[PDB]
Write a protein that binds this ligand. Structure first.
Ligand SMILES: Nc1nc2c(ncn2[C@@H]2O[C@H](COP(=O)(O)OP(=O)(O)NP(=O)(O)O)[C@@H](O)[C@H]2O)c(=O)[nH]1
Lengths: 114, 206, 53, 122, 118, 252
RNA sequence: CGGCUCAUCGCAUCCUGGGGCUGUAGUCGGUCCCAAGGGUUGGGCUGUUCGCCCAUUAAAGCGGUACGCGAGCUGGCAGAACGUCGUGAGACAGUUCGGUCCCUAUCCGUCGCGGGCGCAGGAAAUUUGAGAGGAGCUGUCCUUAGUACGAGAGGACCGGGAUGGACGCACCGCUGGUGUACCAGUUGUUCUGCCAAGGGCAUCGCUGGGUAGCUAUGUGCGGACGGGAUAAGUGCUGAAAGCAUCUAAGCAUGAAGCCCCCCUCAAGAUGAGAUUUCCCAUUCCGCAAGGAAGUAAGAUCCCUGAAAGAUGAUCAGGUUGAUAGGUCUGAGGUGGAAGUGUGGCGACACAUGGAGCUGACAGAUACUAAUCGAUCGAGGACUUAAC
């Protein structure tokens, strides 16, 4: 796909920080409801780190008032303002799928800070 | 009514000045070179013989060797025409690239489908399944041919055959971005064709 | 299902047409021989493109 | 991806608990409803002292899908506990206030009264 | 890749024993289709031999079966690689084997070939 | 709420409403007035018919009987286990119907209908001295000179007071209905009766909380200490139909 | 018997289109013609057609084809219980459960895909399009506009503009599923001498992920613009018939019908089309008619492959070469190897280190494998015109 990857870097964003798959980061999402931008800061833990060049992706799980909210924020998108890390956490793998279940006190064992 | 035709490579995403994660196609073809002008008074109608992906003398042939000296171009492959183009700006030897297309212009694609091989009735003709339990062994089979009194089968009743290898038109598609240096057209949506196969990119027939 | 008829003495002789198998490829050996299947080492000489194996 | 005969949960203070779908209002024939569709509903378990009762049949709005609510803008939202709001007639709910968050997919339609009572819109 | 007519648990053991039988005798008569698949795994064995790591040994050890390989030395199949096969193929990069094909046998219709180390 | 099993059957059966001399109607002794059938009220005119209120096991029954009797209809309570009240219904077939007994030795053929699961299938075997058929579910059968064991029920479907005797189907139509209503009759009419079956000291106000007070005494839990609602629905209808609470009325 | 697959079909139309007349102020209506192009539901409860109920929808159209279709599916007679009748044996378009209907496709039909041969010379490509097939649905919402309307309430028409559903076609970049030679974690025993690290087997040992390809629930897109001729009509001109007329002459107008416009296959369309470009007009036997024999142009045998594929074929390629594999440099994946060192009584932790590993995904690289060879394949008949 060598004749594709040249066009990709020109649209790619480098302003991201690098991050482990299992951690907590904060993200700022530019929202355009009407005319005023309600720039909100969504923070929490991350699960997926499935690649894709242009289409590198991640997921954000955040518990909200008794229920978690899966966030599929796109890495390569101008609607992202800034990604700011919080917890460099010891996670055994790159797929934290099982914390869609043990949602309670299992976020500590997986967030051994480093 | 214009048109280039070229190989495809892959599938990408391009978002431009919005959140629009648009699926894009990888249509990259070289500057097409008009081979031979069909005129109406000589050959019934007007057309443009077009060429693409020119090879070398290993696959050349004294028939196709003289096929290009009128146009003075290397012997290429996939020689097709375009029944709809103008008979003014398309002389014998003229070279056409991607500089013809720009942003916000309806296009048309006719391309060779994927060959899925000899499938069944289900994935070829959209046939649903029978019941998988409750005694009935019957499923994955195209049902009765129909009535009795005809003592025959209606030609047109569906049956598992080999599906693929024919053209598919898709109309009403758009261009998001052009890049002349790598000679790339970018199409919003998805376009029929497996990788390394030719794609006629014609103007979206309004 | 059942063959409803005997097939003919015609059509049976008219069925075996595309059944008879083709001639296999035969190439003249480049050292001591007379015939050898293309692309493959003959068992007579056991040599391939000037190589004893 | 709601379907017919799907178990739903209450997100408002209607006193209801468990909701079984009957038919997807959206279109005709289709049984798949993602977000914001109008879903006619029945009630399998409810607290008694409240606005509605057990087994009542009413109309409702989907709030939470486990399946992917997907924007045009590349963003994605999926909830965990598939909940639903209990509305009456118009786009005004029959509830007092909302248990928990609702997605921001109600902007397309005129559901902008339940978004006002939201503790969170993402 | 070809399924080689056996199931998977048979398939992984279908070929490991061939690799032992390859690097010992250096020259096997084999059914050509099984031979055609085999060359693209044993060149991965030989190039893994050309590292010389102990880590290079154990990945081969998970593959190569511990046959007694060469007589009166007690050279193992492992211990024939990194002392003799690596130095025999120091300069040549890729293309450690070939498939010269032979005719079919008497009672199979199966086409044959010969796999050597070159 | 019921198919072509009672309505469709009666439609074709209603064609024998001229050879029938005496009609035997059936209403519930626990709830009289909803246990009529307004579809069979329209087919049965100008026939002497006697009302029966079976499974009588008394104060409310007699009171209602008095008002019913003055209504134009005769009401005679019978039994399904013991032989009491059957000595006034046997002689009433030749006394009340004296218009077709000595006018011409013609037979006395009776049509027995009304509400299902209230004493219709058990009205033939004690009037005789042999069993015929019986079901403890909502349904029955599809059959003195007597060939009459069908069912009237209701062609089109107040129901809160209906299903407490279990006259309808309850596989899954509604189970929480008899839970939410029937305890209020134990709350409003006979509050003292609940204090002994599960050992409660005082009836609380939350009718959902009294389930958990009952159900933890029961033990039909579902998961991790949670008492199941639907199992506790069963243990209330299992007791009221076997008259574990005693003789209770419904309408006054 | 009723369903399930699947259909196709009639019009005596269920809705959507086109007008008529009413009880249509406007909105909304019943009812009668045109119309068969599509489109015409999901549950409880019913043997189930009967019927009942709920929620729908633009509305859940009638009906035919062995009451459409069991070599495609779908049991959905002996024993009993019974009642009743007959003394009894045993009866019953009487009631309830328990209860086995077979097929490798010869032919014709079908759905594909080939091979021969034709098309007055071979080839190579490009196409023409008679003719056939597919596509033909709509719902909400926003303007115009509370405008036209009517004591009011009500509130469009015509016509733009968003957004759905169903359904069809394409595709893997997102979104998830799959992945049996990928990745690690771990049990039980056995196995390489032991330790360590590994192998084998146990549904692929098991659990956690996943490239590729293939995929829908995912994504893109389709049913537009229209023209032409007609129905019911709507009319204009006027005859028969001094008025007058939808009609006779003669004009128009007017439908999702119908041709045509979109799409696809289509010169074996035996009418075998047509251009473009090759290729030569040999050697020979027979008075001649001709018959061979080499070969071009070229194709193929044969060989490595897959974008192809049940095989054939198609397509990439065959040593002035990147088709495949190996090799590298990578991508993606899992993700912290072994060894060593440290720390811990140890189980294990931490360090070297986003490590090590990797199946079809890339990109370079002749290192292997595509050798060496063979076969087929044309000399263009005959009238007559114009040249
Ligand atoms: N104690 C008591 N039990 C009764 C009385 N009547 C009926 N039962 C019991 O309740 C059950 C239901 O009676 P049944 O006559 O079968 O109800 P049904 O209305 O005739 N049903 P269907 O109309 O479908 O034939 C019987 O099994 C019987 O034992 C009664 O008067 N008293």
């Amino acid at each position: 796909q060598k004749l594709i990857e040249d066009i990709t870097k020109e649209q790619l964003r480098t302003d991201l920080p690098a991050f482990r798959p299992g951690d907590t980061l904060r993200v700022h999402v530019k929202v355009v409801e009407g005319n005023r931008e309600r720039i909100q800061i969504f923070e929490g833990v991350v699960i997926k780190r499935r690649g894709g060049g242009i289409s590198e992706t991640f997921t954000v799980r955040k518990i909200s008032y008794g229920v978690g909210v899966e966030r599929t924020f796109p890495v390569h998108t101008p609607k992202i303002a800034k990604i700011e890390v919080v917890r460099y956490g010891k996670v055994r793998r790159a797929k934290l799928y099982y914390l869609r279940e043990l949602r309670g006190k299992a976020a500590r064992i997986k967030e051994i800070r480093r | 009514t214009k048109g280039i035709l070229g190989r495809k490579i892959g599938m990408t995403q391009v978002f431009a000045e919005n959140g629009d994660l648009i699926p894009v196609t990888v249509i990259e073809a070289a500057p097409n070179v008009v081979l031979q002008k069909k005129t109406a008074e000589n050959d019934g109608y007007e057309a443009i013989q077009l060429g693409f992906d020119d090879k070398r003398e290993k696959l050349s042939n004294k028939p196709e060797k003289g096929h290009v000296a009128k146009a003075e171009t290397a012997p290429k492959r996939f020689v097709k025409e375009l029944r709809g183009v103008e008979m003014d700006a398309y002389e014998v030897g003229q070279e056409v690239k991607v500089e013809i297309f720009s942003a916000g212009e309806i296009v048309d694609v006719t391309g060779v489908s994927k060959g899925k091989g000899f499938q069944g009735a289900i994935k070829r003709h959209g046939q649903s399944r029978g019941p998988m339990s409750h005694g009935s062994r019957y499923h994955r089979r195209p049902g009765s041919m129909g009535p009795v009194d005809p003592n025959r089968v209606f030609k047109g009743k569906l049956l598992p055959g080999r599906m693929g290898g024919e053209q598919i038109t898709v109309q009403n598609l758009e261009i998001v971005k052009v890049d002349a240096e790598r000679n790339l057209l970018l199409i919003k949506g998805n376009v029929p064709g497996a990788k390394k196969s030719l794609i006629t990119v014609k103007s979206a027939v309004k | 299902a059942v063959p409803f008829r005997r097939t003919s003495k015609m059509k049976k002789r008219l069925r075996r047409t595309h059944f008879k198998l083709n001639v296999p490829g035969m190439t003249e050996c480049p050292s001591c021989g007379e015939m050898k299947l293309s692309h493959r080492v003959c068992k007579a000489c056991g040599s391939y493109n000037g190589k004893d194996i | 991806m709601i379907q017919q005969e799907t178990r739903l949960k209450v997100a408002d203070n209607s006193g209801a608990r468990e909701v079984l779908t009957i038919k997807v209002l959206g279109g005709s024939g289709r049984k798949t409803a993602n977000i914001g569709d109008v879903i006619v509903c029945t009630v399998k378990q409810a607290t008694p002292g409240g606005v509605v009762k057990k087994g009542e049949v009413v109309k409702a709005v989907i709030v939470r899908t486990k399946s992917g609510a997907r924007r045009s803008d590349g963003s994605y939202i999926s909830f965990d506990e598939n909940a639903c709001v209990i509305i009456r007639d118009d786009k005004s709910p029959r509830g007092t206030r909302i248990f928990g968050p609702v997605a921001r997919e109600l902007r397309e339609n005129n559901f902008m009264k339940i978004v006002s009572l939201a503790p969170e819109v993402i | 890749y070809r399924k080689l007519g056996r199931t998977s648990a048979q398939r992984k053991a279908m070929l490991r024993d061939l690799t032992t039988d390859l690097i010992i005798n250096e020259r096997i008569e084999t059914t050509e289709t099984r031979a055609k698949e085999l060359r693209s795994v044993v060149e991965k064995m030989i190039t893994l031999g050309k590292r010389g790591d102990l880590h290079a040994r154990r990945q081969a050890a998970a593959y190569i079966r511990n046959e007694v390989a060469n007589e009166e030395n007690n050279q193992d199949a492992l211990q024939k690689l990194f002392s003799d096969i690596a130095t025999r193929y120091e300069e040549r990069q890729g293309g450690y084997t070939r498939i010269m094909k032979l005719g079919p046998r008497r009672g199979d219709g199966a086409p044959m070939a010969i796999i050597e180390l070159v | 709420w019921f198919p072509g099993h009672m309505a469709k059957a009666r439609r074709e059966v209603t064609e024998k409403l001229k050879l029938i001399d005496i009609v035997y109607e059936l209403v519930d002794a626990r709830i009289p007035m909803s246990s009529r059938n307004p579809m069979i009220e329209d087919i049965l005119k100008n026939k002497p018919r006697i009302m029966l209120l079976n499974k009588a096991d008394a104060a409310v029954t007699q009171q209602w009987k008095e008002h019913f009797e003055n209504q134009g209809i005769r009401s005679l309570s019978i039994n399904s286990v013991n032989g009491q009240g059957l000595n006034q219904i046997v002689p009433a077939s030749k006394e009340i119907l004296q218009e077709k007994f000595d006018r011409m030795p013609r037979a006395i053929r009776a049509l027995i209908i009304g509400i299902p699961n209230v004493g219709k299938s058990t009205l033939i075997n004690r009037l005789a001295k042999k069993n015929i058929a019986k079901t403890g579910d909502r349904p029955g059968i599809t059959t003195l000179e007597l060939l009459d064991t069908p069912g009237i029920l209701w062609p089109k479907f107040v129901g809160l007071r209906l299903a407490v005797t279990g006259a309808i189907k309850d596989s899954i139509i509604n189970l929480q209905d008899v839970a939410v209503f029937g305890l209020r009759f134990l709350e409003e009419h006979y509050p003292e009766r609940l204090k002994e079956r599960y050992g409660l000291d005082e009836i609380p106000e939350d009718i959902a909380e009294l389930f958990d007070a009952i159900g933890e005494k029961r033990g039909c839990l579902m998961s991790g200490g949670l008492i199941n609602y639907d199992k506790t629905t069963e243990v209330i209808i299992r007791d009221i139909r076997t008259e574990k609470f005693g003789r209770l009325s419904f309408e006054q």
